[PDB]
Scaffold this active site. Structure first.
Site, PDB file in Angstrom:
ATOM      1  N   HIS A 106       0.776  -1.232   0.000  1.00  0.00           N
ATOM      2  CA  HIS A 106       0.000   0.000   0.000  1.00  0.00           C
ATOM      3  C   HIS A 106       0.817   1.298   0.000  1.00  0.00           C
ATOM      4  CE1 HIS A 106       0.949   0.431   4.230  1.00  0.00           C
ATOM      5  NE2 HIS A 106       0.404   1.633   4.177  1.00  0.00           N
ATOM      6  N   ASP A 159      -0.461  -6.778   2.277  1.00  0.00           N
ATOM      7  CA  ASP A 159       0.307  -5.546   2.279  1.00  0.00           C
ATOM      8  C   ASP A 159       1.782  -5.887   2.273  1.00  0.00           C
ATOM      9  OD1 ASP A 159       0.609  -2.888   2.226  1.00  0.00           O
ATOM     10  OD2 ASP A 159      -0.362  -2.506   4.181  1.00  0.00           O
ATOM     11  N   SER A 183       4.855   3.131   8.054  1.00  0.00           N
ATOM     12  CA  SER A 183       4.320   2.062   7.228  1.00  0.00           C
ATOM     13  C   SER A 183       5.366   1.641   6.207  1.00  0.00           C
ATOM     14  CB  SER A 183       3.047   2.531   6.531  1.00  0.00           C
ATOM     15  OG  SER A 183       2.075   2.920   7.489  1.00  0.00           O
ATOM     16  N   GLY A 184       5.497   0.334   6.006  1.00  0.00           N
ATOM     17  CA  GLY A 184       6.469  -0.193   5.062  1.00  0.00           C
ATOM     18  C   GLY A 184       7.782  -0.442   5.778  1.00  0.00           C
TER      19      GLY A 184
HETATM   20  O1  XMJ Z   1      -6.223   5.346  12.099  1.00  0.00           O
HETATM   21  C1  XMJ Z   1      -5.418   5.361  11.157  1.00  0.00           C
HETATM   22  C2  XMJ Z   1      -3.890   5.646  11.480  1.00  0.00           C
HETATM   23  N1  XMJ Z   1      -2.913   5.678  10.341  1.00  0.00           N
HETATM   24  S1  XMJ Z   1      -1.223   5.990  10.665  1.00  0.00           S
HETATM   25  O2  XMJ Z   1      -1.092   6.933  11.878  1.00  0.00           O
HETATM   26  O3  XMJ Z   1      -0.611   6.627   9.405  1.00  0.00           O
HETATM   27  C3  XMJ Z   1      -0.337   4.533  10.973  1.00  0.00           C
HETATM   28  C4  XMJ Z   1      -0.770   3.620  11.870  1.00  0.00           C
HETATM   29  C5  XMJ Z   1       0.032   2.412  12.266  1.00  0.00           C
HETATM   30  C6  XMJ Z   1       0.374   2.191  13.680  1.00  0.00           C
HETATM   31  C7  XMJ Z   1       1.143   1.040  14.074  1.00  0.00           C
HETATM   32  C8  XMJ Z   1       1.594   0.079  13.078  1.00  0.00           C
HETATM   33 CL1  XMJ Z   1       2.503  -1.311  13.540  1.00  0.00          CL
HETATM   34  C9  XMJ Z   1       1.271   0.286  11.683  1.00  0.00           C
HETATM   35  C10 XMJ Z   1       0.510   1.422  11.275  1.00  0.00           C
HETATM   36  C11 XMJ Z   1      -3.282   4.847   9.163  1.00  0.00           C
HETATM   37  C12 XMJ Z   1      -4.725   5.169   8.675  1.00  0.00           C
HETATM   38  N2  XMJ Z   1      -5.769   5.142   9.773  1.00  0.00           N
HETATM   39  C13 XMJ Z   1      -7.172   4.878   9.369  1.00  0.00           C
HETATM   40  C14 XMJ Z   1      -7.599   3.395   9.256  1.00  0.00           C
HETATM   41  C15 XMJ Z   1      -8.705   3.155   8.173  1.00  0.00           C
HETATM   42  C16 XMJ Z   1      -9.156   1.661   8.056  1.00  0.00           C
HETATM   43  N3  XMJ Z   1      -8.111   0.553   8.298  1.00  0.00           N
HETATM   44  C17 XMJ Z   1      -8.430  -0.835   7.943  1.00  0.00           C
HETATM   45  C18 XMJ Z   1      -7.467  -1.931   8.167  1.00  0.00           C
HETATM   46  C19 XMJ Z   1      -7.841  -3.268   7.802  1.00  0.00           C
HETATM   47  N4  XMJ Z   1      -9.076  -3.573   7.248  1.00  0.00           N
HETATM   48  C20 XMJ Z   1     -10.000  -2.561   7.026  1.00  0.00           C
HETATM   49  C21 XMJ Z   1      -9.735  -1.187   7.352  1.00  0.00           C
HETATM   50  C22 XMJ Z   1      -6.749   0.920   8.913  1.00  0.00           C
HETATM   51  C23 XMJ Z   1      -6.371   2.446   9.018  1.00  0.00           C
END
Ligand code: XMJ
Ligand code: CA
Lengths: 235, 51
Positions: free
Chosen positions: A42, A88, A185-186
């Site tokens: 991603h 991912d 991320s990544g």
């Molecule tokens: O609430 C968030 C926060 N960010 S972020 O701050 O940049 C990174 C977060 C992160 C933390 C610890 C670690 Cl090991 C890795 C990543 C990402 C986007 N969102 C919004 C959400 C929106 C929906 N999501 C889904 C995940 C799976 N299936 C469906 C939906 C995840 C992120």
């Protein structure tokens, strides 16, 4: 990163930072070898054209050997699903080899079983990046490293709000303000075993940043070994 | 035998590829002559923090 230590000289040499056109960090990566970088599928959707930097610990004071490289080919995962952050994981073949020096070396790829059995059952694991210091904050110039403990899968799936497919696994804390975050991320997730670190994860996603009742979701590298292996044979 | 007792006494990868314990290292390491220790072959092996 949210509340963690700093990567002192030579500790996180396998870190890699995907830079955007304006030369800003926007994702992490892991040096698998001189030609290959491992990142999150991603991440490729966050920039029109990017490059991969290495050997950098301070994004302001030009240190010893930080090198920039250009992407020859991008190898996303067939099954990468946008909406469910499922599958991912990607791989980047660089146009010019990477020269290993202080602050610039590759993390080891383990074998699935042994990894998921020994490596994955250890207490903590290390994650690093140049991502935001905490939720609503600004990125981060210094490269950090946090010792995040593995999370019980059942206690993991319960805390979520979204399916945790087989290609994932939680890691972090319940309340202790410590976790990965935007711009990580990544990034690499490594497990230490007898003074030898191994790739055991990919900063995939999370709900917020170091929130109570939530953990950091990482991509399960051990489930993609054979895939990563093929990719590093160009295809 | 038993990669459970203590990783089979291996520095890294451990398997019971037979009736006993068999050790192996990552790419860029050669299994020493005591079938357990992992010896770096190159100048900058994976896993090691640069020093
Ligand atoms: O609430 C968030 C926060 N960010 S972020 O701050 O940049 C990174 C977060 C992160 C933390 C610890 C670690 Cl090991 C890795 C990543 C990402 C986007 N969102 C919004 C959400 C929106 C929906 N999501 C889904 C995940 C799976 N299936 C469906 C939906 C995840 C992120
Ligand atoms: Ca610098």
């Amino acid at each position: 990163i949210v509340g963690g230590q700093e990567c002192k000289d030579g500790e996180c040499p396998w870190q890699a930072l995907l830079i955007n056109e304006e030369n800003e960090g926007f994702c992490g990566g892991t040096i698998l070898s001189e030609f290959y970088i491992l990142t999150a599928a991603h991440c490729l959707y966050q920039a029109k054209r990017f490059k991969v930097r290495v050997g950098d610990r301070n994004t302001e004071q030009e240190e010893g050997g930080e090198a920039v490289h250009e992407v020859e080919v991008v190898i996303k995962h067939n099954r990468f699903t946008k909406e469910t952050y499922d599958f991912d994981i990607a791989v980047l073949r660089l146009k010019t080899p990477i020269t290993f020096r202080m602050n610039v070396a590759p993390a080891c790829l383990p074998e699935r079983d042994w990894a998921e059995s020994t490596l994955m059952t250890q207490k903590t694991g290390i994650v690093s990046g140049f991502g935001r210091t905490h939720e609503k904050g600004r990125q981060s110039t210094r490269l950090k490293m946090l010792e995040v403990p593995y999370v019980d899968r059942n206690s993991c799936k319960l805390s979520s709000s979204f399916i945790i497919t087989q290609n994932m696994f939680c890691a972090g804390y319940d309340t202790k303000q410590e976790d990965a975050c935007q711009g990580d991320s990544g990034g690499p997730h490594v497990t230490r075993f007898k003074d030898t670190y191994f790739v055991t994860g990919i900063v995939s996603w999370g709900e917020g940043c170091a929130r109570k009742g939530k953990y950091g979701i990482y991509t399960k590298v051990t489930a993609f070994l054979k895939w990563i292996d093929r990719s590093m044979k160009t295809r | 035998k038993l990669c459970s007792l203590d990783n089979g006494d291996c520095d890294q990868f451990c398997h019971e590829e037979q009736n006993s314990v068999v050790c192996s290292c990552a790419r860029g390491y050669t299994l020493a002559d005591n079938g357990k220790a992992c010896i770096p072959t190159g100048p900058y092996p994976c896993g090691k923090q640069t020093l």
